[PDB]
């Protein structure tokens, strides 16, 4: 809920909690440190959003393959599991001789 | 705390520091809750179709507007002198200010 709260804090360009600035405006400003406001023409705003559409679907579609983002996640839940198995096999190790 | 820094500075607000939480530029930032730690989507900005043009940055050459040691400005020709940002090749009207 909070992540949705975090995300939709930008998704209401009427009233937004990402520095108070509207979102469709906000895509034209982090570019404007590098790109030019005249250059996006308001044209590439639709093209970046269509690419953002093309991002988010391919974000969904590229996720099903073995991705780097899944990579560390499967590692750490294994890095937990290898630790506890080393902790559990420890219980039956016969330190003393009997 | 690196994540706290990223959710406070990359996610929530905008950036004035450049090379933080990724590479290149940072167009947007998102956040989705993932198992055992949240994870983001750093929407980086990648150009494709490169070109070329002559450029003379320091204005060591050919003052037309009288006594111009102006600076801070890129160069392409065929206008008089034009400024381009470091992403999109485009002539301005004039230099910035």
């Amino acid at each position: 809920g909070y992540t949705t709260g975090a995300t939709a804090a930008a998704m209401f360009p009427p009233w937004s909690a990402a520095a108070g600035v509207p979102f469709s405006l906000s895509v034209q400003y982090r570019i404007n440190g590098l790109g030019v406001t005249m250059n996006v023409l308001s044209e590439n705003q639709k093209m970046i959003a269509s690419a953002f559409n093309n991002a988010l679907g391919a974000i969904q579609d590229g996720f099903d393959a073995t991705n780097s983002a899944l990579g560390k996640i499967q590692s750490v839940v294994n890095a937990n599991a290898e630790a506890l198995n080393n902790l559990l096999n420890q219980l039956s190790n016969r330190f003393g001789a009997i | 705390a690196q994540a706290i820094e990223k959710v406070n500075e990359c996610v929530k607000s905008q950036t004035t520091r450049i090379n933080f939480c990724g590479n290149g530029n940072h167009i947007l930032s998102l956040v989705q809750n993932a198992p055992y730690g949240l994870y983001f989507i750093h929407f980086s900005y990648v150009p494709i179709s490169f070109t070329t043009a002559n450029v003379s940055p320091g204005l060591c050459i050919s003052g037309d507007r009288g006594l111009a040691p102006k600076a801070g400005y890129f160069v392409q020709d065929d206008g008089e002198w034009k400024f381009t940002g470091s992403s999109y090749y485009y002539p301005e009207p004039i230099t910035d200010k």
């Binding site: 998704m11 979102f23 269509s50 969904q60 099903d64 | 989705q32």
Partner: peptide
């Protein structure tokens, strides 16, 4: 988060209602 909350997009940046939590269940 003002309730007066609807589940469709209004800004033109698409799927931000769809990909808001579709990426959740894939994880």
């Amino acid at each position: 988060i003002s309730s007066r909350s609807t589940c469709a997009e209004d800004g033109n940046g698409p799927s931000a209602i769809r990909g808001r939590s579709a990426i959740e269940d894939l994880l």
